[PDB]
């Protein structure tokens, strides 16, 4: 699995479940094309977005929509969208883990890149 | 100032200097319209983005051009930008400070509101 | 596995391998007793520190020593020690993941707590 | 000031006020000896910890009493403290700023050095 997304709640110390994840890939005409999507599991993780065959070199956008997570906590969120943009596999295939840490007034995102 | 941005470099233990910062405000059509931009100072800070009365209630996005910052230091980073979205509500005069902590593969952004 | 430690390098975007991890448990006489130890794997993770049977309620210290990781990168570290102190299983058994993110001038640590 | 500490609360979007901060310096016997302590102000900052000439080269530890801070807000946090260790080298006059970003289950600490 070359692309994994994890979402965690820094206030609760908990995985963020049912967060919608969208992955886009920049096309030849400089438009964002859809690439993959899913929802985070009970562990706050989403695997199986792509395979090494499909996950070619390129510029990718990963966007999360946390509305359902906040709703289920009885929270009315001020805003519920985060996105990072990165270049993938530019030095050959890698496995990527993108982790987001959520809080009402702060956001952190970390990438871990390994050679498989 | 009602709005300030502060940017730190975790690799060098220093303010992030001359980093470009763009502020957008969500318009009625749900598009991000330009609001203000600037570059961080020698102390990593950016002031003078808006007056009190132009800084109206709404949804703002701060977009920090971290890719160009790291490449100027000879580092190939992960992210294209560091970003934060925050809501400005209608209140008495409040100060908004956006603080960003940058590394090549990780960042954190925080919105601090003071009276 | 109720206690996991992960260590990552925010400059390289890499797991931190061969980081020594020491876990202590506060004793009746208010001294730190040894509890478990290990070294992080190639994935920057250490599992198998303890079992649910041994990992009782208590006050625990987790300390890492990164000297070997910095050495292997050809880095002469200014300092190479980090520690957190936490109370475990106070509301019944939990699984704990303690993650550290390393950089020359910054340190971050995050705890993820799940009910198994 | 040569040494300042700044502490932010990520849950409330505010400076962390009245937080106790202890600074230690490693002694010859490799023990942490007390160096200075204080509480953060209404802006989350702590100055006046040391004079320039008392802030000698060495290895310093800053220990922020986050457990009591969160419990005063009715929150049971994970960590006992937020900590950072930094080395002060012998240089020309330098400013050291320790910045801490606090949440109940996560924190980050950064040492920023300026001339
Ligand atoms: Re990005
Ligand atoms: Re993300
Ligand atoms: Re906000
Ligand atoms: Re701690
Ligand atoms: Re740790
Ligand atoms: Re340092």
UniProtKB/Swiss-Prot annotation, chains A, C:
The modification 4-carboxyglutamate is found at residue 33. Changing residue 107 to S: In AMYLD1; amyloid polyneuropathy. GO terms for cellular component: azurophil granule lumen; extracellular exosome; extracellular region; extracellular space; protein-containing complex. Glycans are attached at residue 89. Changing residue 105 to H: In CTS1; amyloid deposit on carpal tunnel; patients show no other abnormalities. Changing residue 62 to A: In AMYLD1; amyloid polyneuropathy. Changing residue 115 to S: In AMYLD1; uncertain significance. Changing residue 38 to A: In AMYLD1; amyloid polyneuropathy. Detected in serum and cerebrospinal fluid (at protein level). Highly expressed in choroid plexus epithelial cells. Detected in retina pigment epithelium and liver. The keyword Lipid metabolism does not apply. The modification Phosphoserine is found at residue 43. Tetramer dissociation and partial unfolding leads to the formation of aggregates and amyloid fibrils. Small molecules that occupy at least one of the thyroid hormone binding sites stabilize the tetramer, and thereby stabilize the native state and protect against misfolding and the formation of amyloid fibrils. Homotetramer. Dimer of dimers. In the homotetramer, subunits assemble around a central channel that can accommodate two ligand molecules. Interacts with RBP4. Each monomer has two 4-stranded beta sheets and the shape of a prolate ellipsoid. Antiparallel beta-sheet interactions link monomers into dimers. A short loop from each monomer forms the main dimer-dimer interaction. These two pairs of loops separate the opposed, convex beta-sheets of the dimers to form an internal channel. It is linked to Amyloidosis, hereditary systemic 1: A form of hereditary systemic amyloidosis, a disorder characterized by amyloid deposition in multiple tissues resulting in a wide clinical spectrum. AMYLD1 is an autosomal dominant form due to transthyretin amyloid deposition. Protein fibrils can form in different tissues leading to amyloid polyneuropathies, amyloidotic cardiomyopathy, carpal tunnel syndrome, systemic senile amyloidosis. The disease includes leptomeningeal amyloidosis that is characterized by primary involvement of the central nervous system. This is Transthyretin. The chain holds residues 30 to 145 of 147 of the full protein.
